[PDB]
PDB file of C-alpha atoms and ligand atoms in Angstrom:
ATOM      1  CA  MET A   1      -0.174   4.516   8.990  1.00 56.50           C
ATOM      2  CA  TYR A   2      -0.328   8.245   8.293  1.00 59.59           C
ATOM      3  CA  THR A   3      -0.957  10.991  10.839  1.00 60.95           C
ATOM      4  CA  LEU A   4      -2.905  14.269  10.707  1.00 60.55           C
ATOM      5  CA  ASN A   5      -3.379  16.944  13.351  1.00 56.66           C
ATOM      6  CA  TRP A   6      -6.355  18.764  14.853  1.00 57.72           C
ATOM      7  CA  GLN A   7      -6.847  21.579  17.357  1.00 55.59           C
ATOM      8  CA  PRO A   8      -8.546  20.824  20.713  1.00 56.62           C
ATOM      9  CA  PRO A   9     -11.241  20.475  21.710  1.00 54.89           C
ATOM     10  CA  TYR A  10     -12.662  17.799  19.433  1.00 54.78           C
ATOM     11  CA  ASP A  11     -15.814  15.987  20.521  1.00 55.13           C
ATOM     12  CA  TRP A  12     -15.040  12.582  19.000  1.00 54.03           C
ATOM     13  CA  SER A  13     -17.882  10.813  20.797  1.00 51.22           C
ATOM     14  CA  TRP A  14     -20.405  13.110  19.126  1.00 51.59           C
ATOM     15  CA  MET A  15     -18.735  12.729  15.711  1.00 54.52           C
ATOM     16  CA  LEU A  16     -18.666   8.914  15.609  1.00 53.61           C
ATOM     17  CA  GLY A  17     -22.169   8.943  17.054  1.00 54.00           C
ATOM     18  CA  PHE A  18     -23.229  11.124  14.148  1.00 54.43           C
ATOM     19  CA  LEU A  19     -21.593   8.854  11.558  1.00 52.50           C
ATOM     20  CA  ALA A  20     -22.739   5.636  13.240  1.00 51.90           C
ATOM     21  CA  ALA A  21     -26.401   6.608  12.899  1.00 50.99           C
ATOM     22  CA  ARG A  22     -25.873   7.493   9.275  1.00 47.83           C
ATOM     23  CA  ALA A  23     -23.537   4.602   8.483  1.00 48.29           C
ATOM     24  CA  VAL A  24     -24.511   2.447   5.479  1.00 48.96           C
ATOM     25  CA  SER A  25     -24.335  -1.286   6.178  1.00 52.33           C
ATOM     26  CA  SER A  26     -21.523  -3.012   4.353  1.00 52.96           C
ATOM     27  CA  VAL A  27     -19.897   0.307   3.518  1.00 53.83           C
ATOM     28  CA  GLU A  28     -18.974   1.917   6.813  1.00 52.56           C
ATOM     29  CA  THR A  29     -18.044   0.525  10.187  1.00 50.40           C
ATOM     30  CA  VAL A  30     -18.298   2.858  13.114  1.00 53.37           C
ATOM     31  CA  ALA A  31     -17.176   2.109  16.631  1.00 53.93           C
ATOM     32  CA  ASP A  32     -16.294   3.968  19.815  1.00 52.69           C
ATOM     33  CA  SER A  33     -12.588   4.286  19.036  1.00 52.30           C
ATOM     34  CA  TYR A  34     -12.404   4.236  15.241  1.00 49.21           C
ATOM     35  CA  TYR A  35     -14.066   4.723  11.879  1.00 51.24           C
ATOM     36  CA  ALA A  36     -13.597   2.699   8.696  1.00 53.18           C
ATOM     37  CA  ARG A  37     -15.150   2.303   5.277  1.00 52.23           C
ATOM     38  CA  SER A  38     -14.590   1.160   1.726  1.00 50.81           C
ATOM     39  CA  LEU A  39     -13.195   3.831  -0.605  1.00 51.37           C
ATOM     40  CA  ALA A  40     -12.627   4.047  -4.356  1.00 53.13           C
ATOM     41  CA  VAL A  41     -10.367   6.630  -5.986  1.00 54.48           C
ATOM     42  CA  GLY A  42     -10.437   5.857  -9.692  1.00 54.38           C
ATOM     43  CA  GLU A  43      -9.558   2.195 -10.145  1.00 52.76           C
ATOM     44  CA  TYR A  44      -7.903   2.150  -6.722  1.00 53.20           C
ATOM     45  CA  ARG A  45      -9.996   0.408  -4.085  1.00 52.62           C
ATOM     46  CA  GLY A  46      -9.602  -0.513  -0.432  1.00 54.28           C
ATOM     47  CA  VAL A  47     -10.384   0.128   3.202  1.00 52.75           C
ATOM     48  CA  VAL A  48      -9.576   3.308   5.077  1.00 52.75           C
ATOM     49  CA  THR A  49      -9.432   3.296   8.861  1.00 52.45           C
ATOM     50  CA  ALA A  50      -9.272   6.363  11.085  1.00 52.50           C
ATOM     51  CA  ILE A  51      -8.055   6.060  14.682  1.00 53.27           C
ATOM     52  CA  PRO A  52      -8.056   9.146  16.889  1.00 53.80           C
ATOM     53  CA  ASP A  53      -5.433   9.718  19.600  1.00 53.55           C
ATOM     54  CA  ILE A  54      -7.266  12.236  21.758  1.00 54.05           C
ATOM     55  CA  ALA A  55      -4.407  12.838  24.186  1.00 52.17           C
ATOM     56  CA  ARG A  56      -2.039  13.792  21.380  1.00 54.81           C
ATOM     57  CA  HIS A  57      -4.825  15.345  19.262  1.00 52.17           C
ATOM     58  CA  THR A  58      -3.621  13.376  16.234  1.00 47.10           C
ATOM     59  CA  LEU A  59      -5.746  11.201  13.933  1.00 46.79           C
ATOM     60  CA  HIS A  60      -3.986   8.019  12.714  1.00 46.55           C
ATOM     61  CA  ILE A  61      -5.137   6.746   9.295  1.00 46.01           C
ATOM     62  CA  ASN A  62      -4.556   3.189   7.986  1.00 45.34           C
ATOM     63  CA  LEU A  63      -5.044   2.248   4.343  1.00 43.30           C
ATOM     64  CA  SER A  64      -5.271  -1.218   2.837  1.00 43.86           C
ATOM     65  CA  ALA A  65      -2.726  -2.007   0.110  1.00 45.76           C
ATOM     66  CA  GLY A  66      -5.093  -1.083  -2.737  1.00 43.65           C
ATOM     67  CA  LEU A  67      -5.177   2.598  -1.777  1.00 43.65           C
ATOM     68  CA  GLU A  68      -1.504   3.313  -1.095  1.00 45.18           C
ATOM     69  CA  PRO A  69      -0.918   4.752  -4.595  1.00 45.29           C
ATOM     70  CA  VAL A  70      -3.494   7.463  -3.847  1.00 45.64           C
ATOM     71  CA  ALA A  71      -2.832   7.718  -0.107  1.00 46.65           C
ATOM     72  CA  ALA A  72      -2.657  11.532  -0.242  1.00 48.62           C
ATOM     73  CA  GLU A  73      -6.110  11.951  -1.737  1.00 43.91           C
ATOM     74  CA  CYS A  74      -7.357   9.422   0.827  1.00 43.85           C
ATOM     75  CA  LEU A  75      -5.889  11.525   3.611  1.00 42.56           C
ATOM     76  CA  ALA A  76      -7.456  14.626   2.075  1.00 43.40           C
ATOM     77  CA  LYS A  77     -10.886  12.963   2.055  1.00 41.20           C
ATOM     78  CA  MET A  78     -10.644  11.948   5.741  1.00 42.29           C
ATOM     79  CA  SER A  79      -9.687  15.534   6.673  1.00 37.47           C
ATOM     80  CA  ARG A  80     -12.787  16.885   4.996  1.00 35.02           C
ATOM     81  CA  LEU A  81     -14.989  14.208   6.571  1.00 35.38           C
ATOM     82  CA  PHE A  82     -13.776  15.024  10.090  1.00 36.03           C
ATOM     83  CA  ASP A  83     -13.229  18.746   9.569  1.00 35.19           C
ATOM     84  CA  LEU A  84      -9.615  18.743  10.840  1.00 37.66           C
ATOM     85  CA  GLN A  85      -9.124  22.361   9.729  1.00 39.77           C
ATOM     86  CA  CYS A  86     -11.623  23.755  12.199  1.00 40.68           C
ATOM     87  CA  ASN A  87     -10.481  26.349  14.691  1.00 37.42           C
ATOM     88  CA  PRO A  88     -12.860  25.790  17.681  1.00 39.91           C
ATOM     89  CA  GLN A  89     -11.705  28.942  19.510  1.00 40.68           C
ATOM     90  CA  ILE A  90     -12.809  31.156  16.629  1.00 36.14           C
ATOM     91  CA  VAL A  91     -16.097  29.407  15.905  1.00 32.29           C
ATOM     92  CA  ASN A  92     -17.080  29.216  19.581  1.00 31.59           C
ATOM     93  CA  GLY A  93     -16.022  32.818  20.118  1.00 29.55           C
ATOM     94  CA  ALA A  94     -18.380  34.031  17.396  1.00 27.47           C
ATOM     95  CA  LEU A  95     -21.207  31.591  18.266  1.00 28.55           C
ATOM     96  CA  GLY A  96     -20.987  32.614  21.907  1.00 26.33           C
ATOM     97  CA  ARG A  97     -23.407  30.953  24.304  1.00 26.08           C
ATOM     98  CA  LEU A  98     -24.792  28.639  21.588  1.00 28.42           C
ATOM     99  CA  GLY A  99     -21.556  26.701  21.377  1.00 28.77           C
ATOM    100  CA  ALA A 100     -20.853  26.787  25.115  1.00 28.23           C
ATOM    101  CA  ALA A 101     -22.598  23.419  25.485  1.00 23.00           C
ATOM    102  CA  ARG A 102     -20.222  21.339  23.376  1.00 20.91           C
ATOM    103  CA  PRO A 103     -17.254  23.312  22.031  1.00 21.48           C
ATOM    104  CA  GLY A 104     -15.841  20.131  20.455  1.00 21.84           C
ATOM    105  CA  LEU A 105     -18.685  19.976  17.910  1.00 22.69           C
ATOM    106  CA  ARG A 106     -17.387  19.515  14.361  1.00 26.20           C
ATOM    107  CA  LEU A 107     -18.954  19.726  10.846  1.00 28.58           C
ATOM    108  CA  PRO A 108     -19.303  16.169   9.464  1.00 26.05           C
ATOM    109  CA  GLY A 109     -18.265  16.207   5.809  1.00 26.44           C
ATOM    110  CA  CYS A 110     -17.910  13.348   3.350  1.00 27.97           C
ATOM    111  CA  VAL A 111     -15.434  11.212   1.441  1.00 28.34           C
ATOM    112  CA  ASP A 112     -16.826  11.923  -2.052  1.00 27.58           C
ATOM    113  CA  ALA A 113     -19.217  14.671  -3.196  1.00 29.73           C
ATOM    114  CA  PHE A 114     -21.074  12.419  -5.634  1.00 29.60           C
ATOM    115  CA  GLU A 115     -21.808   9.920  -2.870  1.00 33.25           C
ATOM    116  CA  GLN A 116     -22.998  12.611  -0.475  1.00 31.37           C
ATOM    117  CA  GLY A 117     -25.200  14.082  -3.197  1.00 31.20           C
ATOM    118  CA  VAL A 118     -26.730  10.633  -3.506  1.00 27.89           C
ATOM    119  CA  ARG A 119     -27.238  10.480   0.271  1.00 30.10           C
ATOM    120  CA  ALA A 120     -28.857  13.914   0.465  1.00 27.79           C
ATOM    121  CA  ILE A 121     -31.422  12.884  -2.132  1.00 27.88           C
ATOM    122  CA  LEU A 122     -32.029   9.590  -0.339  1.00 28.39           C
ATOM    123  CA  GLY A 123     -32.430  11.559   2.875  1.00 29.35           C
ATOM    124  CA  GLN A 124     -35.422  13.366   1.357  1.00 26.70           C
ATOM    125  CA  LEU A 125     -38.676  13.306   3.382  1.00 27.60           C
ATOM    126  CA  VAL A 126     -37.386  10.406   5.477  1.00 28.52           C
ATOM    127  CA  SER A 127     -35.689   9.686   8.821  1.00 25.45           C
ATOM    128  CA  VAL A 128     -31.966   9.095   9.300  1.00 30.78           C
ATOM    129  CA  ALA A 129     -32.558   5.380   9.981  1.00 31.13           C
ATOM    130  CA  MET A 130     -34.852   4.864   6.979  1.00 30.14           C
ATOM    131  CA  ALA A 131     -32.377   6.805   4.832  1.00 28.54           C
ATOM    132  CA  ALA A 132     -29.437   4.563   5.857  1.00 31.90           C
ATOM    133  CA  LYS A 133     -31.528   1.448   5.270  1.00 34.02           C
ATOM    134  CA  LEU A 134     -32.378   2.706   1.775  1.00 31.79           C
ATOM    135  CA  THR A 135     -28.819   3.710   0.933  1.00 27.33           C
ATOM    136  CA  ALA A 136     -27.672   0.223   1.928  1.00 27.13           C
ATOM    137  CA  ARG A 137     -30.051  -1.428  -0.560  1.00 27.87           C
ATOM    138  CA  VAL A 138     -28.878   0.888  -3.304  1.00 28.86           C
ATOM    139  CA  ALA A 139     -25.226   0.109  -2.496  1.00 30.24           C
ATOM    140  CA  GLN A 140     -26.027  -3.593  -2.145  1.00 29.49           C
ATOM    141  CA  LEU A 141     -27.584  -3.645  -5.609  1.00 29.59           C
ATOM    142  CA  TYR A 142     -25.238  -1.296  -7.550  1.00 30.95           C
ATOM    143  CA  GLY A 143     -22.099  -1.524  -5.420  1.00 32.95           C
ATOM    144  CA  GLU A 144     -18.959  -3.569  -6.035  1.00 33.05           C
ATOM    145  CA  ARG A 145     -17.426  -5.865  -3.421  1.00 32.21           C
ATOM    146  CA  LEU A 146     -13.766  -5.642  -2.433  1.00 28.39           C
ATOM    147  CA  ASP A 147     -11.797  -8.732  -3.463  1.00 27.58           C
ATOM    148  CA  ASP A 148      -9.328  -8.508  -0.584  1.00 24.88           C
ATOM    149  CA  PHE A 149     -12.012  -7.465   1.933  1.00 25.16           C
ATOM    150  CA  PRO A 150     -15.224  -9.450   1.136  1.00 26.02           C
ATOM    151  CA  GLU A 151     -17.122  -7.848   4.019  1.00 25.09           C
ATOM    152  CA  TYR A 152     -16.916  -4.434   2.324  1.00 24.25           C
ATOM    153  CA  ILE A 153     -18.711  -3.055  -0.711  1.00 24.09           C
ATOM    154  CA  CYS A 154     -17.880   0.236  -2.494  1.00 27.77           C
ATOM    155  CA  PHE A 155     -20.536   2.912  -2.839  1.00 28.40           C
ATOM    156  CA  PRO A 156     -22.083   2.701  -6.332  1.00 24.88           C
ATOM    157  CA  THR A 157     -20.047   4.549  -8.977  1.00 26.23           C
ATOM    158  CA  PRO A 158     -21.600   7.235 -11.277  1.00 26.47           C
ATOM    159  CA  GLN A 159     -21.289   4.964 -14.332  1.00 24.23           C
ATOM    160  CA  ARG A 160     -23.249   2.171 -12.668  1.00 23.84           C
ATOM    161  CA  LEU A 161     -26.001   4.442 -11.303  1.00 20.55           C
ATOM    162  CA  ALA A 162     -26.217   6.129 -14.699  1.00 18.71           C
ATOM    163  CA  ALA A 163     -27.460   2.948 -16.367  1.00 17.76           C
ATOM    164  CA  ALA A 164     -29.612   1.795 -13.453  1.00 19.12           C
ATOM    165  CA  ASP A 165     -33.244   1.172 -14.363  1.00 17.84           C
ATOM    166  CA  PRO A 166     -35.443   3.879 -12.731  1.00 18.98           C
ATOM    167  CA  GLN A 167     -37.870   1.132 -11.665  1.00 17.49           C
ATOM    168  CA  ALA A 168     -35.040  -0.897 -10.103  1.00 18.86           C
ATOM    169  CA  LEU A 169     -34.122   1.940  -7.747  1.00 16.93           C
ATOM    170  CA  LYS A 170     -37.864   2.594  -7.346  1.00 14.57           C
ATOM    171  CA  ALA A 171     -38.451  -0.916  -5.998  1.00 16.83           C
ATOM    172  CA  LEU A 172     -35.851  -0.267  -3.267  1.00 16.46           C
ATOM    173  CA  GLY A 173     -38.258   2.231  -1.677  1.00 20.19           C
ATOM    174  CA  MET A 174     -38.421   5.610  -3.434  1.00 20.10           C
ATOM    175  CA  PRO A 175     -40.716   7.440  -5.887  1.00 20.58           C
ATOM    176  CA  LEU A 176     -39.790   7.374  -9.596  1.00 16.81           C
ATOM    177  CA  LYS A 177     -38.920  11.065  -9.363  1.00 18.24           C
ATOM    178  CA  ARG A 178     -36.320  10.337  -6.654  1.00 19.09           C
ATOM    179  CA  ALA A 179     -34.855   7.533  -8.749  1.00 18.08           C
ATOM    180  CA  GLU A 180     -34.631   9.861 -11.750  1.00 17.33           C
ATOM    181  CA  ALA A 181     -32.930  12.552  -9.707  1.00 12.34           C
ATOM    182  CA  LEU A 182     -30.233  10.061  -8.796  1.00 11.35           C
ATOM    183  CA  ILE A 183     -29.823   8.912 -12.398  1.00 11.07           C
ATOM    184  CA  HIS A 184     -29.392  12.526 -13.514  1.00 11.46           C
ATOM    185  CA  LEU A 185     -26.970  13.227 -10.657  1.00 14.18           C
ATOM    186  CA  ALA A 186     -24.912  10.286 -11.871  1.00 13.62           C
ATOM    187  CA  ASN A 187     -24.592  11.788 -15.364  1.00 12.53           C
ATOM    188  CA  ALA A 188     -23.840  15.223 -13.931  1.00 16.40           C
ATOM    189  CA  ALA A 189     -20.945  13.672 -12.017  1.00 17.73           C
ATOM    190  CA  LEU A 190     -19.696  11.964 -15.199  1.00 18.77           C
ATOM    191  CA  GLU A 191     -19.695  15.255 -17.175  1.00 21.41           C
ATOM    192  CA  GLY A 192     -18.253  17.344 -14.351  1.00 20.62           C
ATOM    193  CA  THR A 193     -21.240  19.690 -13.876  1.00 18.76           C
ATOM    194  CA  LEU A 194     -21.509  18.711 -10.208  1.00 19.12           C
ATOM    195  CA  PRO A 195     -18.834  20.540  -8.164  1.00 18.11           C
ATOM    196  CA  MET A 196     -16.773  17.873  -6.418  1.00 20.01           C
ATOM    197  CA  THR A 197     -15.050  20.476  -4.276  1.00 21.14           C
ATOM    198  CA  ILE A 198     -16.530  23.575  -2.689  1.00 18.86           C
ATOM    199  CA  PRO A 199     -17.009  26.408  -5.219  1.00 20.36           C
ATOM    200  CA  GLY A 200     -15.891  29.980  -4.602  1.00 19.74           C
ATOM    201  CA  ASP A 201     -19.486  31.169  -4.697  1.00 19.21           C
ATOM    202  CA  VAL A 202     -21.732  28.745  -2.835  1.00 19.57           C
ATOM    203  CA  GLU A 203     -25.042  30.576  -3.284  1.00 16.06           C
ATOM    204  CA  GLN A 204     -24.618  30.692  -7.069  1.00 12.58           C
ATOM    205  CA  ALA A 205     -23.670  27.028  -7.195  1.00 12.54           C
ATOM    206  CA  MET A 206     -26.610  25.944  -5.023  1.00 13.78           C
ATOM    207  CA  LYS A 207     -28.880  27.977  -7.299  1.00 17.26           C
ATOM    208  CA  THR A 208     -27.584  26.020 -10.277  1.00 14.34           C
ATOM    209  CA  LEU A 209     -27.885  22.794  -8.267  1.00  7.74           C
ATOM    210  CA  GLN A 210     -31.612  23.313  -7.767  1.00  3.98           C
ATOM    211  CA  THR A 211     -32.220  23.604 -11.512  1.00  3.61           C
ATOM    212  CA  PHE A 212     -31.685  19.853 -11.358  1.00  3.53           C
ATOM    213  CA  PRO A 213     -34.726  17.531 -11.352  1.00  4.89           C
ATOM    214  CA  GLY A 214     -35.564  16.313  -7.864  1.00  3.05           C
ATOM    215  CA  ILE A 215     -33.278  18.682  -5.966  1.00  2.00           C
ATOM    216  CA  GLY A 216     -35.046  21.056  -3.618  1.00  2.00           C
ATOM    217  CA  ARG A 217     -33.865  23.788  -1.266  1.00  2.00           C
ATOM    218  CA  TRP A 218     -33.354  21.365   1.638  1.00  2.00           C
ATOM    219  CA  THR A 219     -31.379  18.852  -0.437  1.00  2.00           C
ATOM    220  CA  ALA A 220     -29.363  21.730  -1.928  1.00  2.00           C
ATOM    221  CA  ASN A 221     -28.473  23.249   1.429  1.00  2.00           C
ATOM    222  CA  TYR A 222     -27.747  19.887   3.074  1.00  2.00           C
ATOM    223  CA  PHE A 223     -25.607  18.837   0.134  1.00  2.00           C
ATOM    224  CA  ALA A 224     -23.563  22.055   0.286  1.00  2.00           C
ATOM    225  CA  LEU A 225     -23.136  21.693   4.021  1.00  2.00           C
ATOM    226  CA  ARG A 226     -21.905  18.041   3.981  1.00  2.00           C
ATOM    227  CA  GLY A 227     -20.852  17.732   0.371  1.00  2.00           C
ATOM    228  CA  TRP A 228     -18.768  20.911   0.177  1.00  2.00           C
ATOM    229  CA  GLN A 229     -18.388  21.555   3.901  1.00  2.00           C
ATOM    230  CA  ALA A 230     -19.779  25.048   3.525  1.00  2.00           C
ATOM    231  CA  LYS A 231     -19.690  26.701   6.971  1.00  2.00           C
ATOM    232  CA  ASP A 232     -22.421  29.323   6.546  1.00  2.00           C
ATOM    233  CA  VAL A 233     -25.487  27.341   5.523  1.00  2.00           C
ATOM    234  CA  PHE A 234     -28.671  26.879   7.537  1.00  2.00           C
ATOM    235  CA  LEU A 235     -31.584  24.487   6.905  1.00  2.00           C
ATOM    236  CA  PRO A 236     -34.831  26.409   7.603  1.00  2.00           C
ATOM    237  CA  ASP A 237     -36.802  23.646   5.860  1.00  2.00           C
ATOM    238  CA  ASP A 238     -35.305  20.898   8.045  1.00  2.00           C
ATOM    239  CA  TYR A 239     -37.982  18.904   9.897  1.00  2.00           C
ATOM    240  CA  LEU A 240     -36.035  18.769  13.147  1.00  2.00           C
ATOM    241  CA  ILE A 241     -35.322  22.492  12.843  1.00  2.00           C
ATOM    242  CA  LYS A 242     -39.053  23.226  12.655  1.00  2.00           C
ATOM    243  CA  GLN A 243     -39.439  21.352  15.960  1.00  2.00           C
ATOM    244  CA  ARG A 244     -36.789  23.620  17.463  1.00  2.00           C
ATOM    245  CA  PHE A 245     -38.664  26.640  16.046  1.00  2.00           C
ATOM    246  CA  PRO A 246     -42.380  25.977  16.833  1.00  2.00           C
ATOM    247  CA  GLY A 247     -44.770  28.142  14.835  1.00  2.00           C
ATOM    248  CA  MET A 248     -42.068  29.966  12.902  1.00  2.00           C
ATOM    249  CA  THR A 249     -42.123  29.552   9.132  1.00  2.00           C
ATOM    250  CA  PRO A 250     -39.032  28.748   7.054  1.00  2.00           C
ATOM    251  CA  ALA A 251     -38.595  32.453   6.210  1.00  2.00           C
ATOM    252  CA  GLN A 252     -38.766  33.438   9.898  1.00  2.00           C
ATOM    253  CA  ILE A 253     -36.274  30.756  10.871  1.00  2.00           C
ATOM    254  CA  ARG A 254     -34.007  31.970   8.072  1.00  2.00           C
ATOM    255  CA  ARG A 255     -34.308  35.475   9.496  1.00  2.00           C
ATOM    256  CA  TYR A 256     -33.522  34.254  12.995  1.00  3.05           C
ATOM    257  CA  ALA A 257     -30.380  32.400  11.885  1.00  4.36           C
ATOM    258  CA  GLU A 258     -28.699  35.432  10.273  1.00  4.03           C
ATOM    259  CA  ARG A 259     -27.309  36.243  13.700  1.00  5.12           C
ATOM    260  CA  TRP A 260     -24.893  33.292  13.453  1.00  3.69           C
ATOM    261  CA  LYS A 261     -23.293  34.403  10.203  1.00  6.37           C
ATOM    262  CA  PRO A 262     -20.777  33.521   8.932  1.00  7.17           C
ATOM    263  CA  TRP A 263     -20.938  30.183  10.768  1.00  5.22           C
ATOM    264  CA  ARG A 264     -24.547  29.089  10.292  1.00  4.08           C
ATOM    265  CA  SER A 265     -23.442  25.535   9.423  1.00  4.04           C
ATOM    266  CA  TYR A 266     -21.911  25.177  12.886  1.00  2.28           C
ATOM    267  CA  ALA A 267     -24.963  26.883  14.385  1.00  2.00           C
ATOM    268  CA  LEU A 268     -27.157  24.321  12.642  1.00  3.32           C
ATOM    269  CA  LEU A 269     -25.223  21.441  14.218  1.00  6.32           C
ATOM    270  CA  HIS A 270     -25.464  22.817  17.756  1.00  4.97           C
ATOM    271  CA  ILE A 271     -29.195  23.482  17.387  1.00  7.00           C
ATOM    272  CA  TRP A 272     -29.623  19.973  16.028  1.00  5.79           C
ATOM    273  CA  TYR A 273     -27.872  18.621  19.132  1.00  4.81           C
ATOM    274  CA  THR A 274     -29.385  20.797  21.886  1.00  5.26           C
ATOM    275  CA  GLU A 275     -32.503  19.005  22.999  1.00  3.17           C
ATOM    276  CA  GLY A 276     -34.307  21.713  24.887  1.00  3.38           C
ATOM    277  CA  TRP A 277     -33.113  24.446  22.584  1.00  6.24           C
ATOM    278  CA  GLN A 278     -35.543  27.268  21.986  1.00  6.49           C
ATOM    279  CA  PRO A 279     -35.387  30.771  20.473  1.00  6.55           C
ATOM    280  CA  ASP A 280     -35.048  34.114  22.240  1.00  6.00           C
ATOM    281  CA  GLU A 281     -37.479  37.021  22.266  1.00  4.36           C
ATOM    282  CA  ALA A 282     -37.296  40.524  20.787  1.00  4.84           C
TER     283      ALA A 282
HETATM  284  O1  LIG B 301     -36.603  16.186   2.924  1.00  5.56           O
HETATM  285  C1  LIG B 301     -36.417  16.675   4.013  1.00  5.56           C
HETATM  286  N1  LIG B 301     -36.768  18.002   4.251  1.00  5.56           N
HETATM  287  C2  LIG B 301     -36.600  18.675   5.463  1.00  5.56           C
HETATM  288  N2  LIG B 301     -36.051  18.068   6.581  1.00  5.56           N
HETATM  289  C3  LIG B 301     -35.709  16.763   6.335  1.00  5.56           C
HETATM  290  C4  LIG B 301     -35.139  15.869   7.237  1.00  5.56           C
HETATM  291  N3  LIG B 301     -34.989  14.743   6.570  1.00  5.56           N
HETATM  292  N4  LIG B 301     -35.394  14.788   5.337  1.00  5.56           N
HETATM  293  C5  LIG B 301     -35.865  16.063   5.140  1.00  5.56           C
END
């Protein structure tokens, strides 16, 4: 049982709510007071559990025996998933009124960049629910079960998804193109062309990321945001975002969002979670 710290406020209800909707069956388990999921670091496999202690603003992490050797990297992954580094006072100060609603809003990251990349692609032109349902089938088919914890299955590894038959993934509910994008992503991960950690120059990296087959602007932005935890990325192509900005084109929305620099990623979250949100006038 390890412990990590965070700076108040931290809207935990919103965070687990966010992960619960996107949770992949037989990978993650999200509840009101904790989060848990299978996790593979090299040949080390197990179950990671995160328990927040709101009062003492400390997150308690529990690892199953198979992950102890790489505990540190497991702790590092949890910190990036829950954005423990965030300084709410600064972000809310810059965001101003926009963040006034819920100052405890955090940027949901990930546990592994290759996995998230896979999720972003699977999230293409489809709802959160449909996406999760699809990702579960993919994990069910190409994932490996935990010996000590039979109820859990590890997200498919790059090697496995590299040799997956395009048609096989196709049958799960995606176009051939989508299935080929994933296959390529798998090989990119194997070679090391896919940045597993946030790069010094995000824009350049995203640019390179889009030269990949099946990776558009939305997927690219979304991946950077969750996959690298980039704080200044907006999604002008996002379907929900369009709803929030009626009539305005992607370019206009992109122009509108410049006012939240250099925290557009946090701006994106708040806009996503303010129901009756609407733009100004000028
Ligand atoms: O592919 C996609 N493009 C833009 N917004 C969304 C939302 N979900 N999936 C999307």
